[model samples]
Target chain A: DIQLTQSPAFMAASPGEKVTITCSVSSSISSSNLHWYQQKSETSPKPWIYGTSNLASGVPVRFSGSGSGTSYSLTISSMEAEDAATYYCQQWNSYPYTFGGGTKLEIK
Target chain B: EVKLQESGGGLVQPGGSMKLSCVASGFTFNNYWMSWVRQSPEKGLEWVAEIRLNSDNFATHYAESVKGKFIISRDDSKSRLYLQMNSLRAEDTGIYYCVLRPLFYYAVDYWGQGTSVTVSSA
Candidate 1:
């Protein structure tokens, strides 16, 4: 199983500010696929960023992603009130596709 | 446009097996893969496993600490898939979800409303 470590278990960002979440894999997952998801309380998790950088359909343009190999990042161009939630990075390159511990974003 | 609906009993007795179903609609089932995820009380998402609709190929990712059994299956005629686990325990209580492949890969995009299974004496 590939271990995924995420930084900053919690984050606080003001509206219009840029917030970034990072995820690192223990082994090389370069060609492997990376995806980002936003999950809020009481709602089903939604895919925000996929294929490393391609934004999922119906996702806001403010959310973007970039990175490769063992390291990956998800950036919210300009944060909004709705963006306050938990974000997770998932790696499908290996068995038991693991997900980051998760980073909770709050409004400051 | 693809949608998944998960249905199953909410309460089960200890050491009993619980079965859950996920019905797919509006898309080609054989063209995509299906996966099951479980979320324990306030815990992050955990990947249970995935299975291909065309060949019934399956893979499991459950932790070794989990003593209970888990399985994934699909029904072509009803467009439904089933997740069955045996020897239920208190730790098995959580929200179980069925998810569909995103596009080109296994990243789940569409998910079911989720079914809650509680292990308790009836």
Candidate 2:
């Protein structure tokens, strides 16, 4: 099983400040195949970024994903209060796939 | 457009049985890969099982931890996929979600609202 380790399990940043959460997979994953999800309380988690950098359909452009191999990240261009939520990263390159431990982001 | 709604949450007796359903809307019933993912603070987001409904060729995959106990099936007539489990235990309780993607090893485009399951030790 491939392991995915996410850093800064908790992040506190003020609105308008750019924030980036990192995920390091035990194995390599392509830049164009990794994915991201945004989870909020009581609501379904929505796919925010796919193929590393491509925004999911209907996803806002403020969020972006980048990096390849074992290092990857989810960067929010201009963080807003609405963006304060848990973010998870998943690698699709491996069988059975894998998900990051998740980073709980809160508006500071 | 894709939408998934999960049901069959709440209370269940340990060692009893429980079933979960994910209603898939706005997509074809065949050759698409739909998976059930659950979340617990201990394990975070975990892939529970998956059902790949192909043209008359239906197959289900479950995680090793719950292989024999978990069953994934579908009701094509109603566009609903199910997750049935027996021998429920305290560890079996969690939030289960239904998500969809077109093929294996791909980004999921849709997610269900999630269903919370609780298994009582008694």
Candidate 3:
């Protein structure tokens, strides 16, 4: 199992400010199979990013990603009120897709 | 335009088996893979297992101690996949999700509405 460690378990940022979450895998997960998800309170989790930097269909352009090897990051360019939620990174390089512990983003 | 829907009983008796179903629509059922995920209050998101639609190949992530007790199957004609776990306990209660695997990798782009399974003495 590839262990995923997310930094800054919790963050506070303004609505118009940028917020970044980092995920480090215990092992190298080839860039081809990395994905990210956003889970809001009481709502089902949604795919925000996939294949490293490819945004899922209908995802806003304000969100972007850039990283490689065991380190990856998800950047919300100009965060909105709706963007406040827990973000998780997932790896598909091996059996049983694994997700990060999750980072909670809140309005500062 | 692919979509997945999960259906199953909300309540199950303890020490019994719980069966759930995921029905696929808006796409060729034979072209993709289906996976099951569980989210319990104690644990975040856990991958239970997955089954390939094209070959009915199944794989599970549950520990080997309980491997033989969990089953994943699909009914190609009905375009539905089934999950059954025996010897259910209170810890088995949670929201179960069925996801559709994309072609390129194990990325799950589409998910079911999710079915909640509650286990009690009843």
Off by over 4 Å in 1: B54-68, B102-108
TM-score of 3: 0.91
Which RMSD values do the candidates have, in order? 2.5, 2.2, 2.2
| Rank order (by TM-score, best first) | 3, 2, 1
Q: Tell me the tens digit of each residue's lDDT in model 2 across B27-77.
A: 773467778888877788888888776555677767668888988888768
Candidate 1 residue pairs in backbone clash: none
Worst 10 residues of 1 chain B by lDDT: B59-68
* True interface contacts reproduced, per candidate: 0.58, 0.67, 0.38
Per lDDT, the best of the predicted structures is 2
Q: Each model's number of backbone clashes?
A: 0, 0, 0
lDDT of 2 at B2: 74
**Which run of 10 residues does model 3 chain B get worst, by summed lDDT?**
B57-66
Better of 1 and 3 by DockQ: 1
Stretch of 10 with least lDDT, candidate 2 chain A:
A89-98
Q: What are the TM-scores, per candidate, against the unseen true structure?
A: 0.89, 0.90, 0.91
